[PDB]
Amino acid sequence: HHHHHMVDAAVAEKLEAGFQKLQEATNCKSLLKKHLTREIFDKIKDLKTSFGSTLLDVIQSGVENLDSGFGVYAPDAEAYSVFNDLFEPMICDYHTGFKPGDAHPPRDFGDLETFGNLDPEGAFIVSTRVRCGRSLAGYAFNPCLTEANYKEMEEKVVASLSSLEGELKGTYYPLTGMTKEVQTQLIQDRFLFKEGDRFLQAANACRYWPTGRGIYHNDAKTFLVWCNEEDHLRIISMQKGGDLKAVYARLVNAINEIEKRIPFSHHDKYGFLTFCPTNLGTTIRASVAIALPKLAADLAKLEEAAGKFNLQVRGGGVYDISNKRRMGLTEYQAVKEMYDGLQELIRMEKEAA
Numbered sequence: 357h358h359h360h361h362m363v364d365a366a367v368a369e370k371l372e373a374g375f376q377k378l379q380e381a382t383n384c385k386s387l388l389k390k391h392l393t394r395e396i397f398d399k400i401k402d403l404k405t406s407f408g409s410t411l412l413d414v415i416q417s418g419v420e421n422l423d424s425g426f427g428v429y430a431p432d433a434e435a436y437s438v439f440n441d442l443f444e445p446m447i448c449d450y451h452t453g454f455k456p457g458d459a460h461p462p463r464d465f466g467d468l469e470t471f472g473n474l475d476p477e478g479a480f481i482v483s484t485r486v487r488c489g490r491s492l493a494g495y496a497f498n499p500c501l502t503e504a505n506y507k508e509m510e511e512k513v514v515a516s517l518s519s520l521e522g523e524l525k526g527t528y529y530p531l532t533g534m535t536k537e538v539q540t541q542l543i544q545d546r547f548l549f550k551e552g553d554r555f556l557q558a559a560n561a562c563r564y565w566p567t568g569r570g571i572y573h574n575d576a577k578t579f580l581v582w583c584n585e586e587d588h589l590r591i592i593s594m595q596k597g598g599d600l601k602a603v604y605a606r607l608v609n610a611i612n613e614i615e616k617r618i619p620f621s622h623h624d625k626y627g628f629l630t631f632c633p634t635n636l637g638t639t640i641r642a643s644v645a646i647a648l649p650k651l652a653a654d655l656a657k658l659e660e661a662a663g664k665f666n667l668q669v670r671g672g673g674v675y676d677i678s679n680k681r682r683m684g685l686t687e688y689q690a691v692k693e694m695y696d697g698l699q700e701l702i703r704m705e706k707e708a709a
C-alpha cells in the first residue's frame with residue numbers, strides 16, 4: 357500500500373520537464389497535449405494510486421512520443437479514479453456519446469437469437485470481426501506488474517483457455533521460447549504480436565518481456581486471444597463472410613467461460629477497465645469488410661447512412677464498417693448498431709440502380 361499523496365523529487369522533476377516538452381511542441385495534436393492544462397497538471401501532479409503509480413506513469417508515453425494520438429495509459433485500475441481530472445476529459449472527448457456524469461451500463465451481451473442473416477449468399481460482406489479487451493481483477497496493469505504477477509496471471513489465463521471445449525478448443529503458444537517455426541506460422545495467420553512499439557515501450561508496458569505473454573487460437577482460426585500484449589487479454593472472434601451472429605455468439609461463449617474462472621476489472625462509470633482508455637466501456641471493436649460498389653459512387657454512405665446507426669466508414673468500393681460507440685451502451689446495443697447499420701447499407705446497395 358502506497359500513500360495517495362507525495363511523489364519524490366525525481367518524479368516531480370520528470371513531470372515538470374514533460375509538461376514543458378508538451379508545451380514547447382506547438383504542432384503536437386495529441387489528446388494529452390489538448391487536455392493536460394496547467395491547472396489540471398498542478399492539481400494532480402503530487403497524487404499516487406495505492407500501487408504507487410504517479411502522473412508520470414500515466415503521461416510518459418505521450419511525452420516521449422509527441423506524435424501520439426491519445427497519449428496516456430492507465431498504469432493500474434485505480435489510476436482512472438486518482439487521475440480522473442485528466443482521464444475524464446480525454447475519455448469523453450475520444451468516445452462518442454459519453455459525457456461526464458454518465459455511468460456506463462452493466463455488461464449485457466443480450467439475446468443472440470435476435471441476430472438474423474445479414475448476407476448468407478456472400479454477395480456483400482467479405483469478413484466479420486469482433487474484438488474485446490479485459491483486465492484481470494486484482495492485478496496491476498503493465499508499468500507496475502511484477503515478474504511474479506506476469507507468471508501467476510499467465511498460469512490463470514492458460515488454465516482457462518486450455519480447458520475450452522468444442523468450438524473454442526485450441527492451442528496456447530507462449531512467447532517465452534517461441535520457435536522461429538511458430539513465429540512464421542502465426543505471422544501467416546496475422547496472429548503474432550512482438551515486443552511493443554515506441555508507444556508501448558515508453559509506457560513501460562514491455563517489462564520482463566516476454567514472460568507471461570502468449571497467444572491462443574482455436575483450431576478453426578476463428579477465435580484468437582492475446583495474453584499481455586497491451587491489455588491482460590485481447591479476445592477476438594472472426595471469420596470470412598457475414599455471419600455476425602456466429603462471430604458474436606462464439607465471442608460471448610468464450611468471455612462467459614473465462615469469467616467463470618477469472619473476474620474482470622470493472623469501474624462504476626467507465627465499464628471494463630483497459631490499459632488504453634480508448635478501449636473502455638464495452639471494449640467492443642467490431643469491424644465488417646463489405647463490398648458496396650454501387651454505394652461507392654456517393655458518400656451519402658459515410659455521414660448520413662452509416663452514421664445514422666453511429667457507424668464509421670473507411671475505404672475499390674470495399675469498406676470497413678465499425679462501431680463508433682464503445683461506452684454508454686450495452687454490448688448488445690453496440691453489436692446491434694452494427695447489425696442494423698449493415699442491414700440499412702445492404703438495402704441501399706440493392707435498391708441503388
Ligand SMILES: NC(=[NH2+])NCCC[C@H](N)C(=O)O
Pocket residue numbers: 417423424425426427428555586632634
Ligand atoms: N493500441 C492502442 N491503444 N492505440 C491507441 C493509442 C496509441 C498511442 N498511445 C497513441 O496515442 O497514439
Ligand SMILES: [K+]
Pocket residue numbers: 448449450451452453454
Ligand atoms: K466525444
Ligand SMILES: [K+]
Pocket residue numbers: 453454683684685
Ligand atoms: K450514451
